[PDB]
Each structure stands twice: as structure tokens, then as C-alpha cells.
Amino acid sequence: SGLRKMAQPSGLVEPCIVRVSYGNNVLNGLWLGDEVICPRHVIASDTTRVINYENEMSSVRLHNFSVSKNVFLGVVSAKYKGVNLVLKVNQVNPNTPEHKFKSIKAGESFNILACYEGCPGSVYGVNMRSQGTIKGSFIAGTCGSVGYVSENATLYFVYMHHLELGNGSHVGSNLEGEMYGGYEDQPSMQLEGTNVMSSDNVVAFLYAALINGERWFVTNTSMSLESYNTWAKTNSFTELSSTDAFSMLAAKTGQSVEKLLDSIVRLNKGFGGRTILSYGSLCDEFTPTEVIRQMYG
Amino acid sequence: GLRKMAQPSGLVEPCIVRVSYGNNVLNGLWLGDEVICPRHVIASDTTRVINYENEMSSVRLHNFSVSKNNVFLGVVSAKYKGVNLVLKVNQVNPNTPEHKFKSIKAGESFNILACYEGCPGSVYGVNMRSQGTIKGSFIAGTCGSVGYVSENATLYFVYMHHLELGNGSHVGSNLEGEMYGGYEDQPSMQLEGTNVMSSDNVVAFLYAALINGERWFVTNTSMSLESYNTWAKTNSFTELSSTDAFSMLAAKTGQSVEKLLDSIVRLNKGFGGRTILSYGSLCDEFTPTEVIRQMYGV
Numbered sequence: 225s226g227l228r229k230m231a232q233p234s235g236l237v238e239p240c241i242v243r244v245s246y247g248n249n250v251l252n253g254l255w256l257g258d259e260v261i262c263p264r265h266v267i268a269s270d271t272t273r274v275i276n277y278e279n280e281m282s283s284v285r286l287h288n289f290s291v292s293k294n295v296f297l298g299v300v301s302a303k304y305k306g307v308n309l310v311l312k313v314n315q316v317n318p319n320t321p322e323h324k325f326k327s328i329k330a331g332e333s334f335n336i337l338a339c340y341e342g343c344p345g346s347v348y349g350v351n352m353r354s355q356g357t358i359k360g361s362f363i364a365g366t367c368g369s370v371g372y373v374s375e376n377a378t379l380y381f382v383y384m385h386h387l388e389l390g391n392g393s394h395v396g397s398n399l400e401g402e403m404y405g406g407y408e409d410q411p412s413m414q415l416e417g418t419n420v421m422s423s424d425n426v427v428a429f430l431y432a433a434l435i436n437g438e439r440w441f442v443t444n445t446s447m448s449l450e451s452y453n454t455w456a457k458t459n460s461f462t463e464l465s466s467t468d469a470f471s472m473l474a475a476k477t478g479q480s481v482e483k484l485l486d487s488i489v490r491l492n493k494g495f496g497g498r499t500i501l502s503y504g505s506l507c508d509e510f511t512p513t514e515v516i517r518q519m520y521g
Numbered sequence: 522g523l524r525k526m527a528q529p530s531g532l533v534e535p536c537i538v539r540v541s542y543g544n545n546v547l548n549g550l551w552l553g554d555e556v557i558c559p560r561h562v563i564a565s566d567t568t569r570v571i572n573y574e575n576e577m578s579s580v581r582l583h584n585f586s587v588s589k590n591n592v593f594l595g596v597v598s599a600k601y602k603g604v605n606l607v608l609k610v611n612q613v614n615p616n617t618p619e620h621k622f623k624s625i626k627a628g629e630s631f632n633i634l635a636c637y638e639g640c641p642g643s644v645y646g647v648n649m650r651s652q653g654t655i656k657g658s659f660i661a662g663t664c665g666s667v668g669y670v671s672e673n674a675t676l677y678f679v680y681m682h683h684l685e686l687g688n689g690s691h692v693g694s695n696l697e698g699e700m701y702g703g704y705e706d707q708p709s710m711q712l713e714g715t716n717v718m719s720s721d722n723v724v725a726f727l728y729a730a731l732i733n734g735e736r737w738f739v740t741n742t743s744m745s746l747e748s749y750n751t752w753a754k755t756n757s758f759t760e761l762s763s764t765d766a767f768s769m770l771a772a773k774t775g776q777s778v779e780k781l782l783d784s785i786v787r788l789n790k791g792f793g794g795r796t797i798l799s800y801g802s803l804c805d806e807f808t809p810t811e812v813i814r815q816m817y818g819v
């Protein structure tokens with residue numbers, strides 16, 4: 225039946241995206257109520273070198289702002305909230321959805337609505353890596369793009385884009401102005417720690433493969449949870465607290481997690497020219513609930 | 522990296538409705554006072570071969586139940602149009618978007634709004650394969666989910682899901698009732714023929730891997746376009762009509778198309794153990810226009 229990296233519908237988020245400009249910098253902002261949130265580096269006079277954000281805030285002028293969506297809104301108030309700029313504007317968004325704010329932990333998945341100059345362009349799914357970054361595809365002009373997730377009909381805003389590390393990783397903020405991974409919103413070479421892959425997600429990915437008729441990687445072998453967790457700590461893998469999150473998947477496929485744990489250790493050395501749903505290497509991008517919901521509704 | 526993206530779904534979501542007839546529950550597309558949906562909904566047994574006109578003559582319109590959130594759309598007329606069921610309802614959709622109907626061709630990308638029993642659930646991009654199938658993720662209750670694509674602000678409805686073949690390939694139709702690939706909407710053994718790889722989309726895929734710093738598959742050898750087309754006729758790849766579509770990509774990457782055509786023939790037999798953009802084999806779901814926009818915007 226298939227497995228694809230899916231995005232949640234974005235109909236509630238698109239009417240809240242706006243264009244935000246200051247001088248020669250233009251990016252996107254999130255319009256909720258009578259306030260606009262956007263990365264604070266929109267007011268930097270020179271993103272070339274390291275920015276003194278206190279100087280840029282002292283030299284700010286509200287008239288130099290422009291916040292528009294197809295409709296122009298004047299800015300009446302500007303203030304820093306963490307690495308985020310918070311702008312009050314003279315009009316309340318009539319399409320403000322019921323929403324909350326949250327932060328994303330490692331291994332969790334959420335949806336990226338990538339936008340360009342206030343125009344929502346595309347939407348796709350991502351997965352939070354252990355160092356506080358995501359493998360997005362942000363390019364020039366995508367700062368301010370919003371991340372979100374829906375849980376039990378509750379809309380959460382969880383991500384706003386900011387920068388791209390030298391290794392290509394993408395660093396963003398939550399919507400209280402706190403940058404993921406402790407990175408700075410400065411144009412300087414910042415290093416990313418070694419990536420610890422989520423064993424919970426890798427196991428779910430292998431279960432998705434079994435449900436789609438892939439089976440060459442499971443043998444008459446089964447590795448113990450403590451034995452796997454010892455292997456995990458020396459090969460940059462999360463330790464599995466238990467196998468309880470896979471009871472349903474294990475009964476439907478008739479394959480235990482312990483059998484799947486042995487395959488991970490074997491598959492970590494390479495697939496040997498074979499495929500697992502087109503992947504040539506292990507993939508920790510799908511959570512267990514992501515898989516269970518896509519395979520069984 | 523190279524990721525499959527989907528155009529946003531704000532215009533499509535409010536047109537999705539839940540259509541149920543007997544024991545069948547699926548989706549429908551509510552446009553004005555017309556609700557299009559797969560015609561198999563009106564069938565009493567989806568396990569055996571279906572007489573569609575005999576079921577149309579026994580169609581009691583009071584048994585339909587069209588629904589969106591809390592609006593109940595009474596069906597006043599029902600008629601076949603190809604493999605699709607076209608219902609006339611007593612209420613016009615106040616959120617009908619400006620749209621047209623389009624037909625996707627092989628090697629072209631579009632978006633899927635995967636809806637489950639009338640509720641829009643997820644959004645993802647797909648690609649049209651030579652035999653009229655796509656490779657997505659559909660399960661029970663997702664029939665009638667809508668394929669769409671926007672070009673220069675023009676919204677096109679292009680796909681409606683119908684069935685899954687035994688090999689996992691997914692089969693749908695356009696909004697005019699013409700089934701892609703010509704497959705029947707019957708629960709019978711139906712083979713998908715030989716799949717033919719779009720060489721346009723593989724060259725685009727290999728270029729995106731060059732921008733991502735993956736260059737182990739490029740050597741110093743080249744291969745003519747004419748000689749690649751001769752090789753493609755017997756290896757189930759489409760022929761290349763021009764190297765012009767990749768003139769931007771070839772300039773930014775420093776590799777002519779002919780050098781990656783040689784890469785195609787080599788990597789077609791297997792990557793030898795290495796990977797490309799996390800793939801284990803050649804991928805052809807990304808058009809040149811797709812790759813260029815994702816890499817360079819504008």
C-alpha cells in the first residue's frame with residue numbers, strides 16, 4: 225500500500241503567512257491576531273559579519289517596516305523576544321486559527337510550510353534530529369517559514385526558520401524565540417554534534433517495510449534489548465527504553481522487535497546492494513505513530 | 522538534500538466530502554452542486570465482478586449520504602461519467618475555488634491530498650509512471666482522494682484514486698472519468714506492464730546529487746545522446762529529445778548531460794554498494810523543472 229514522507233494539511237496555516245521587509249532584507253512572518261512574529265535578523269543592516277543586535281534595535285525605525293499579504297499593515301510596536309522579532313500591527317488577522325505553542329524534541333516529526341516573500345510555496349514533513357536541527361531544503365528567502373503539527377485537532381506552531389549551518393543542516397527557533405540546539409542567529413561557523421539516530425524510528429521504519437512485503441533483512445536471529453542498547457551506545461543510536469511501543473506492529477507482522485534489533489546491527493554495516501522501500505541505508509525519519517497511522521489509519 | 526514536496530492544499534481541503542452507499546465509505550470532490558467520486562461506491566459486492574449499469578438501475582438516491590463536517594448534502598441526481606460517479610446535490614459549495622480539469626502525462630509530478638472517509642489527512646507529492654500508475658500510500662477508505670497541481674496560479678484537478686494493483690502500484694482517473702493507464706475499476710487480476718524509466722527525471726535526480734556533493738558516480742567517460750537513446754530502447758528507459766532542459770544544471774554543476782548518461786548505464790546494473798541521496802537505485806520522480814526550483818528557487 226506504500227510508505228511516503230507525508231505532510232499534514234496546511235489550510236489553517238497559509239492565511240497566517242505574511243511578507244516582512246526592512247530596508248533591503250525581506251522574509252516571512254507569522255500573523256496571529258494583531259501581531260507578527262519573524263526572525264529578528266530582518267533589521268540587520270549587514271548580514272555579512274557578526275551582528276550587534278543591541279545596536280540594530282537602537283537604530284530601528286518603525287516606518288522602515290512593511291508587513292503585507294497580497295493588504296498592507298503598518299507596524300505600531302517592535303520588540304525582541306529571544307531571537308525572534310515581535311511586531312504589533314494595526315489589523316487583526318480575521319483568519320486566526322485556534323492554536324498553541326510547543327517545542328519539538330528529538331525524533332519527533334512535524335510539518336514545514338516553506339514560504340517565499342510571504343507566499344506559501346510548498347509543504348513537507350521533517351524530523352527533529354538529536355542535535356536540534358532538521359534536514360530541510362531551505363534556500364534564500366525562506367527565513368520565517370513556519371513549522372507546525374496537529375495533535376487531536378490542536379494546532380501547534382513549533383518552528384520558524386533562521387539559518388543553515390556550514391554542513392548544510394538547518395537551525396530554527398520555536399515561537400517563544402528560543403533557538404533549537406542552542407545555536408546563535410549569527411553568520412559564523414557553528415559546529416553540529418554527531419547525529420544520534422532514533423532507534424524507535426528505525427524500528428518503525430523496518431516494520432513499515434515488513435508490512436509492504438519487504439523481508440530479506442529479517443532472519444532466524446533475535447538480539448536482546450540489553451545487548452542492542454550496549455551496541456547502540458557505541459554506534460550513535462538511541463537506547464530503547466522498552467519494546468512496548470511496538471506490540472500491535474509486532475502482532476500484525478508476527479515479527480518481534482528483538483528480531484528487528486538484530487537486523488539494525490546487521491543493516492548498519494550496509495545493505496549490500498539491496499533496498500528497503502528504495503532506501504539504501506537506515507532511515508529514522510518516521511516515528512512509530514507516523515507509521516501505524518499511515519499503514520492502518 | 523532532494524525532497525519530494527507538495528503544493529499547499531488550502532484550496533482543495535474544503536471541497537472534500539464523505540460519500541457512503543451501503544457498506545462502502547470513501548471520498549468525493551464537491552465542486553458547485555456536483556460531487557464527483559469513484560463509481561464503485563454504488564456497488565453491493567466489491568469482492569466479485571461488478572455489473573455497473575445493473576447497479577445504476579437499482580440506485581436509490583435516498584441511500585447516498587454525502588457529508589462535510591456537519592452539512593448533509595442530499596443527492597438529487599446520479600449519473601455515470603467514465604469510471605466516476607457524478608452526484609448533483611441540493612447545496613452549492615461556498616468554498617469552490619477557481620479551477621480547471623487537466624490530464625497528467627508520464628513523467629509529470631503532481632500533488633495528492635490523501636483523505637480518509639471524508640477527512641483530509643495528509644499531503645504528499647507523487648509522479649506519473651509510464652503505465653499510468655503512481656507510487657503513493659493509499660489504504661481502506663482513501664478512494665476518491667484528489668490529485669492536484671497549480672501552474673501560474675491556475676488550480677487543476679488531475680487525479681482521483683480508485684484502486685491498488687497487486688504490485689502496490691496505485692491507479693486513478695482524471696476528473697472526466699478516463700482511467701489512467703486504461704485499467705478497469707473491477708476487483709479482478711490486472712497486471713501492470715513493463716515500467717519505463719523517465720530518463721529526463723533521472724538526469725535531474727543525478728544533477729541534484731551533484732549539488733548535494735555526491736559525485737562518486739561521475740567518471741571521466743562520456744556517452745553520446747544518440748548512443749544513450751539506442752541503449753534506452755532496450756533497457757526500458759525513455760529517449761532523451763534534448764540536453765537543453767539541463768543547461769542551467771550542467772553549468773552550475775560542471776558536468777554535461779552526456780557524462781551523466783554514462784552514469785545512468787553504469788548505475789542501472791547496481792550502485793555497487795553505495796547510495797545516492799539515500800536511494801539504493803535510480804529514481805525518476807523528479808522533473809528538471811522540479812529540481813531547478815527546489816535547488817535554486819525563483
Ligand SMILES: *C(=N)[C@H](C[C@@H]1CCNC1=O)NC(=O)[C@@H]1[C@@H]2[C@H](CN1C(=O)[C@@H](NC(=O)C(F)(F)F)C(C)(C)C)C2(C)C
Pocket residue numbers: 251265271362363364365366367368385386387388389390394409410411412413414
Ligand atoms: C534566510 N532567508 C536565510 C536562509 C538560509 C539560506 C540558505 N539556507 C537557509 O536556510 N538565512 C540566512 O541568510 C542566515 C542569516 C545570516 C547568515 N545566514 C545563514 O543561513 C548563513 N549561514 C551562516 O553564516 C553559518 F554558517 F554561520 F551558519 C548562510 C551561509 C547564508 C547559509 C543570519 C543572520 C544567520
Ligand SMILES: *C(=N)[C@H](C[C@@H]1CCNC1=O)NC(=O)[C@@H]1[C@@H]2[C@H](CN1C(=O)[C@@H](NC(=O)C(F)(F)F)C(C)(C)C)C2(C)C
Pocket residue numbers: 225547561567659660661662663664665683684685686687691706707708709710711
Ligand atoms: C478504495 N478506497 C480502495 C483503495 C485501496 C485500498 C488498499 N489500497 C488502495 O489503493 N480501493 C478499492 O476498494 C478497489 C475497488 C475494489 C477493490 N479495490 C482494490 O483496490 C483492490 N485491488 C484489486 O482488486 C486489484 F489488485 F485487482 F487491482 C484491493 C485488493 C482492495 C487493493 C475495486 C472496485 C477495484
